[PDB]
Design a protein around this nucleic acid. Structure first.
Ligand SMILES: Cc1cn([C@H]2C[C@H](O)[C@@H](COP(=O)(O)OP(=O)(O)OP(=O)(O)O)O2)c(=O)[nH]c1=O
Ligand SMILES: [Mg+2]
Length: 428
DNA sequence: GGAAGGACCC
DNA sequence: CCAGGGTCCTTCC
């Protein structure tokens, strides 16, 4: 019921939030304006000469469409909520969510029927579901359950690659090979007369999920596909405790990618969705048809991206676990406009940043402060030394200054902060 | 390589 | 009266 989309829009109307949200949107239509206008200044010649480019490239892309790997994307269901429910029977049959009055990280599925969703403000969620119990996050409790599950996964692909605590990719192609020759008792599990799983990628995933539930009590969903991109889209097709596969042939990819909302693809945000919708693009088939216009309107990197999606292409090799490019700490709070205090709230952030930094014994050389007006407007000043910071005082050194400069930049005006934060980056 | 501003993911 | 952790992509010296 859109009584939801009303209670929300209603409880947002005058907020300084909707305020900046409007300014945000006005700036997107401008980016779009600068596009349609940019478009109009294109001639059939340029355009056709382009169709030639893209069509060739695509022709190559197409010759190297790898369909040998059986990638699997696994996604825990309502992770934080689910976990908090498991640790506390009290919440058993009640609707919950994990967050604060100002922000929910998720809502179990019962709460979802009421319109409550992740990233929705708490006070609003309480508007749609007064009976909503809101549990504070407990990440360590999550990393835990996440390690517990990563254990079950190592079995099918010791080199899996975790995207976030509740998601992961798996190249079960090798497992499937050895599994074709596995005695039924090597795929028989006892429930806690029981069950035995087949040899299909369909079945191994069916097993992987089974194990995960049996072990942590939480259900998960999975997508089975020829490559990364398709898999993550599939893991949501039946999302609550289900799975969906896309067979290893090109038509299968095609039949799925056809009519598939461009926005369901990972990387296409609410913003580029609106820009492509401007050009008349909603699905992947529409997106493909426009492979010409796109090469003239977007970065080589973007339309390159756009082309793979339109053709159902994507990673097929799970790269090694990269490295940490940065580490930050930031807090929101009831307005703080007093300078003495802001220098204090900062000392804290720096001190915290310093300790989470010691846990990984990391040392970077670039510190960025981050400030957010009472109007959500956001500044962000960097500063890179050449000695390699580490300690709390060291960081708070660059930071303190970085901050001073922005206070002064307001000469007699005090910075009306709602948010402040610190990020150290540039490690070895 | 930096410094600013953003889009997107969870 | 709208979070917080991270990564990657332009845009200017
Ligand atoms: C989206 C989103 C997720 N998360 C957290 C909440 C989730 O427990 C966790 C996983 O992301 P999601 O997978 O998108 O959330 P979910 O798994 O709980 O729900 P679903 O069953 O639809 O997959 O990360 C955030 O903290 N902030 C966010 O903005
Ligand atoms: Mg999930």
């Amino acid at each position: 019921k859109e009584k939801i989309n009303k209670i929300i829009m209603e409880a947002t109307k005058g907020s300084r939030f909707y305020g900046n949200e409007l300014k945000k949107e006005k700036q997107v239509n401008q980016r779009i304006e600068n596009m349609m206008q940019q478009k109009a200044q294109i001639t059939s010649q340029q355009l056709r000469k382009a169709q030639l480019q893209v069509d060739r490239f695509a022709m190559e892309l197409e010759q190297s469409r790898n369909l040998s790997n059986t990638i699997v994307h696994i996604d825990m269901d309502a992770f934080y909520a689910a976990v908090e429910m498991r640790d506390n029977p009290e919440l058993k049959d009640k609707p919950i969510a994990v967050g604060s009055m100002s922000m929910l990280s998720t809502s179990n599925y019962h709460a979802r029927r009421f319109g409550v969703r992740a990233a929705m403000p708490g006070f609003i969620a309480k508007r749609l579901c007064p009976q909503l119990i809101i549990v504070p996050p407990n990440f360590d409790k999550y990393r835990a359950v996440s390690k517990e599950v990563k254990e079950i996964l190592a079995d099918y692909d010791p080199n899996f690659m975790a995207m976030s605590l509740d998601e992961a990719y798996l190249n079960i192609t090798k497992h499937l090979e050895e599994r074709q020759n596995w005695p039924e008792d090597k795929r028989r599990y006892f429930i806690k007369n029981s069950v035995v799983f087949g040899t299909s990628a369909q079945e191994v995933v069916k097993e992987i999920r089974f194990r995960i539930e049996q072990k942590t009590t939480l259900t998960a969903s999975a997508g089975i596909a020829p490559n990364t991109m398709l898999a993550k889209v599939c893991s949501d097709k039946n999302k609550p405790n289900g799975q969906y596969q896309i067979l290893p042939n090109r038509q299968a990819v095609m039949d799925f990618i056809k009519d598939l909302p461009i926005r369901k693809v990972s990387g296409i945000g609410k913003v580029t969705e609106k820009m492509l919708k401007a050009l008349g693009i909603i699905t992947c088939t529409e997106l493909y048809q426009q492979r010409a216009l796109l090469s003239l309107l977007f970065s080589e990197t973007s339309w390159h991206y756009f082309l793979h999606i339109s053709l159902g292409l994507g990673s097929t090799h799970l790269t090694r676990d990269g490295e940490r490019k940065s580490m930050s700490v930031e807090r929101t709070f009831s307005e703080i406009n007093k300078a003495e205090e802001q220098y204090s709230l900062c000392q804290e952030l720096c001190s915290e940043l310093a300790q989470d930094l010691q846990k990984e014994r990391l040392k970077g050389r670039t510190v960025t402060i981050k400030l957010k007006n009472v109007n959500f407007e956001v500044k962000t000043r960097a500063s890179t030394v050449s000695s390699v910071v580490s300690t709390a005082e060291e960081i708070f050194a660059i930071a303190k200054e970085l901050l001073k400069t922005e206070i002064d930049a307001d000469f007699p005006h005090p910075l009306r902060l709602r948010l402040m934060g610190v990020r150290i980056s540039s490690f070895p």
